[PDB]
UniProtKB/Swiss-Prot annotation:
The keyword Repeat applies. Keywords: Blood group antigen, Cell membrane, Complement pathway, Disease variant, Disulfide bond, Glycoprotein, GPI-anchor, Host cell receptor for virus entry, Host-virus interaction, Immunity, Innate immunity, Lipoprotein, Membrane, Receptor, Repeat, Secreted, Signal, Sushi. GO terms for biological process: complement activation, classical pathway; innate immune response; negative regulation of complement activation; positive regulation of CD4-positive, alpha-beta T cell activation; positive regulation of CD4-positive, alpha-beta T cell proliferation; positive regulation of cytosolic calcium ion concentration; positive regulation of T cell cytokine production; regulation of complement activation. Expressed on the plasma membranes of all cell types that are in intimate contact with plasma complement proteins. It is also found on the surfaces of epithelial cells lining extracellular compartments, and variants of the molecule are present in body fluids and in extracellular matrix. Disulfide bonds join C3-C44, C30-C60, C65-C107, C93-C123. Belongs to the receptors of complement activation (RCA) family. GO terms for cellular component: cell surface; endoplasmic reticulum-Golgi intermediate compartment membrane; extracellular exosome; extracellular region; ficolin-1-rich granule membrane; Golgi membrane; membrane raft; plasma membrane. The Ser/Thr-rich domain is heavily O-glycosylated. Monomer (major form) and non-disulfide-linked, covalent homodimer (minor form). Interacts with ADGRE5. It comes from Homo sapiens. It is linked to Complement hyperactivation, angiopathic thrombosis, and protein-losing enteropathy: An autosomal recessive disease characterized by abdominal pain and diarrhea, primary intestinal lymphangiectasia, edema due to hypoproteinemia, malabsorption, and less frequently, bowel inflammation, recurrent infections, and angiopathic thromboembolic disease. Patients' T lymphocytes show increased complement activation causing surface deposition of complement and the generation of soluble C5a. This is Complement decay-accelerating factor. Changing S39L: In Dr(a-) antigen. The chain holds residues 161 to 285 of 381 of the full protein.
């Protein structure tokens, strides 16, 4: 009448409103910048004639912004493969072009989807 220790959800949290013995229900969630895919909850049942969880732990996938735009007469100081929450991008102009705007922008989330905070800067010579 006692379930297996819940376990860890990478980039997630398991909340146990009251123990894990027969009858308990633990909840699943994902840290900011991650959406859940799988069970949102699990119950300690007595399947057959044994005590175990009802649902498997879920996964939390990284919410990524789309690929950052490119600016004419300027470049991305080391662009990345994937961009996640909090992670930014920094732009630069070419050697005769004066920057007009936003030096660096950064990846924010918005309804489980990664969007950039602002527009990329422009580069005027």
């Amino acid at each position: 009448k006692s379930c297996p220790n819940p376990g860890q959800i990478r980039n997630g949290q398991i909340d146990v409103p009251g123990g894990i013995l027969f009858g308990a229900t633990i909840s699943f969630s994902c840290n900011t910048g991650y959406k859940l895919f799988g069970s949102t909850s699990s119950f300690c049942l007595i399947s057959g004639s044994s005590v175990q969880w009802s649902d498997p732990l879920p996964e939390c996938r990284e919410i990524y912004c789309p690929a950052p735009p490119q600016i004419d007469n300027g470049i991305i100081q080391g662009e990345r493969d994937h961009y996640g929450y909090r992670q930014s991008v920094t732009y630069a102009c070419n050697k005769g072009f004066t920057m007009i705007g936003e030096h660096s922008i950064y990846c924010t989330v918005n309804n489980d989807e990664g969007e950039w905070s602002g527009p990329p800067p422009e580069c005027r010579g």
